[PDB]
Each structure stands twice: as structure tokens, then as C-alpha cells.
Amino acid sequence: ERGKILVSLMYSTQQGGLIVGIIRCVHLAAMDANGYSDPFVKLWLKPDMGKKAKHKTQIKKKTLNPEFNEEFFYDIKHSDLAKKSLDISVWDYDIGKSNDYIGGCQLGISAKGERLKHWYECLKNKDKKIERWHQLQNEN
Ligand SMILES: CCCCCCCC(=O)OC[C@H](COP(=O)(O)O[C@@H]1[C@H](O)[C@H](O)[C@@H](OP(=O)(O)O)[C@H](OP(=O)(O)O)[C@H]1O)OC(=O)CCCCCCC
Numbered sequence: 766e767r768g769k770i771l772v773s774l775m776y777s778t779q780q781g782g783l784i785v786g787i788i789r790c791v792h793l794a795a796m797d798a799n800g801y802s803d804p805f806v807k808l809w810l811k812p813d814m815g816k817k818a819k820h821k822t823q824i825k826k827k828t829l830n831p832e833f834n835e836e837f838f839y840d841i842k843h844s845d846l847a848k849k850s851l852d853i854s855v856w857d858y859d860i861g862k863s864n865d866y867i868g869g870c871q872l873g874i875s876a877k878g879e880r881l882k883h884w885y886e887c888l889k890n891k892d893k894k895i896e897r898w899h900q901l902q903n904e905n
């Protein structure tokens with residue numbers, strides 16, 4: 766068991782871009798010796814591989830159910846966003862050590878189940894926030 770993450774999507778027509786609302790995560794894997802992790806989420810539109818299109822949340826220190834409530838924005842047209850698969854990666858912050866990898870999940874059309882469904886519902890219903898839970902399982 767390594768938890769799940771509540772993600773929100775909404776394409777704003779007046780602003781022209783995608784709003785990814787990271788709400789929280791629950792029941793994550795304990796990556797530290799104290800029994801916790803220090804989770805923070807990383808968002809990244811995959812096929813660009815350009816650094817001008819990726820974000821990350823603030824470091825929630827010592828919590829297995831972090832409460833982020835952080836929105837991020839990607840300036841991209843609606844036709845160009847249909848090509849994108851937004852990657853999500855939750856990590857554990859170590860203060861004198863490379864960050865432990867907790868989990869991850871990717872939202873795209875080539876994916877299956879709830880990922881393609883969430884991306885698609887984001888693509889169709891605009892000026893409309895769609896929320897969904899996502900199980901971490903990438904092992905990257
Ligand atoms: C260009 C030639 C001259 C320049 C020399 C350049 C030579 C060369 O090619 O190395 C570049 C390489 C790139 O490392 P790399 O891009 O993966 O560094 C991470 C990357 O930038 C992520 O995007 C960051 O996360 P984010 O942005 O926050 O999302 C992360 O920061 P943080 O999240 O951890 O804080 C970074 O750690 O760095 C090394 O030397 C390690 C390989 C050692 C090789 C060992 C193999 C034996």
C-alpha cells in the first residue's frame with residue numbers, strides 16, 4: 766500500500782490553459798525511519814521534456830495524509846493539450862539524502878481505466894472542475 770492522491774482538472778477558457786488542482790494524498794508509504802514520509806508532489810507534462818512546463822507542491826513535513834490545496838497552471842491551447850499526458854510523482858523529502866520515491870501516476874489517453882477517463886472529462890467539460898482519486902503505482 767502506498768496511498769492515493771486527489772487531483773482536480775479544469776481548462777479555463779478565459780485564461781487559456783489547464784488548471785491542475787492538487788488537493789491532498791492519503792495513506793502513503795512510510796519512507797522514513799520515524800514511521801512517516803515528508804511528501805511533495807511533482808507535476809510535469811510529459812512529451813515536452815522542457816522545464817518551462819512542470820511544477821511541484823510545498824514540502825509537507827512529517828505527514829502520511831498531506832493537505833496541499835495547491836493549484837498549478839499550464840499555458841496550452843485546447844488542441845495542443847489533447848496530445849499531452851500529465852505525469853504526477855509523489856516523493857519523500859530527505860534533508861540529507863536524495864528524495865525517496867513514494868509513488869506516481871500519469872493522466873493520458875494512452876493510459877487505461879480512470880486516467881484516460883479523468884483526462885477526457887477534463888477535455889470535455891470546460892470551465893468545470895473535475896476531481897478524482899488516483900492510486901500511486903509507477904515504481905519509478
Ligand atoms: C553539457 C556538458 C557539460 C555539462 C556537464 C553536464 C553533464 C551531465 O549530463 O549531467 C547532468 C545531470 C542532470 O541531472 P538531472 O537533470 O537529472 O537533475 C535533476 C533534474 O534536473 C530534475 O528535473 C530536478 O527535479 P525538478 O526540476 O525540481 O522537478 C532534480 O532536482 P531535485 O528535485 O532533486 O531537487 C535534479 O536533481 O546531472 C548529473 O551530473 C548527474 C549524472 C551523473 C552521471 C553519473 C553516471 C556515471
Ligand SMILES: [Ca+2]
Nearest residue numbers: 796797859865
Ligand atoms: Ca526517507
Ligand SMILES: [Ca+2]
Nearest residue numbers: 797803858859
Ligand atoms: Ca524524509
